[PDB]
Amino acid sequence: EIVLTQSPDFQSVTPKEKVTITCRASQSISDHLHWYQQKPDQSPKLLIKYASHAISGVPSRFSGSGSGTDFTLTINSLEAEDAATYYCQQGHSFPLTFGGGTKVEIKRTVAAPSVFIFPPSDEQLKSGTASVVCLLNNFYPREAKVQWKVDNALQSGNSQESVTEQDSKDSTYSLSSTLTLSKADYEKHKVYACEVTHQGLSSPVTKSFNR
């Protein structure tokens, strides 16, 4: 059981900057360390072999170095492309082993949310429940807050959020907040507002609808 420890565990890098990642083995595996990249929902992708040998069809951007106990992977010019999580693997003895991974996030310029609000459809509505969703599209950083308002009464504990992965082209995040109510509860009210608070927004944004 060779155990592998990567560093850092999470990391925020400005575009066109260098990313360094390190492994620490628990004994000397010398040469026998590989690096994989894994974007979400995809199988890993071999990057480096042995432990400074390049794979064919892999950017000159990536490179590795190190021996025995300490190994370093480097992306020389961070591209949006490279928003993944990085693994090292040891090939010195069975069982075969990977590190905990290193999430790398790309620290691009501040972007501002584009906000949209969607009434529940009359098909869903006719089925008893009403979902009102608020789309915060393409923003950076990830952090933001969403406040539901119904007839100006501040809603709590009936909403749920999901945040997408970092775009691989412009590197921005999207968020979805879903308010679920009873159909009866739905028409006991008239105005429904998605109030959005974020760094790129000079003042909070509210998007709403009626009827």
Place this chain on the structure above:
Amino acid sequence: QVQLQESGPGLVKPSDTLSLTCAVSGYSITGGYSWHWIRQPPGKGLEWMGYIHYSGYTDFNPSLKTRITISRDTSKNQFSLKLSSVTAVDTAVYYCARKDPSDAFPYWGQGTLVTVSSASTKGPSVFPLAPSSKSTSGGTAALGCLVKDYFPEPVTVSWNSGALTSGVHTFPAVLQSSGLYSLSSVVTVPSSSLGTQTYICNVNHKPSNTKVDKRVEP
């Protein structure tokens, strides 16, 4: 080009035994190399499970040895995986991988997610998120699919059969209070294309054998 392709029931009950097969095409499992099974718990990292050699020789990771077996059909070019007495720890994405002597893994399958619960499969309902604008606005409009009340993971969402790719965001499923999953899929379009083009979400949930197209209109 090799091609690894795993299939297996995506929901198996706890204490039952998980069976997975990897169909391998474009290369012979008796030709060379080693054929590996690796899993990834959701949110976690890759754990190597075991393998079978081209020779037919197998080995495994301990912490699994006493409940795991691996076999093959050379006539069918597939090897298989049996994991008995399954618990929630085994909820993961499972990968086929063909390992070189390096010993690195250049080739892997897409991964299939097995989730371990006593709960029943529920096909989803699909509701539309009407476009934010009319076709005479002249800016950008957003419309989506809302896939709601399904179990288990995963569901797959494409737009217009997959011709529409740019400006599509599919949110990770969110586990609701009723222990049912739910997500949304949204797309941003030039508003002018709302009167020239029809947007359909194709929602696909194998475990319930459900394939739904929804025409999203005002």
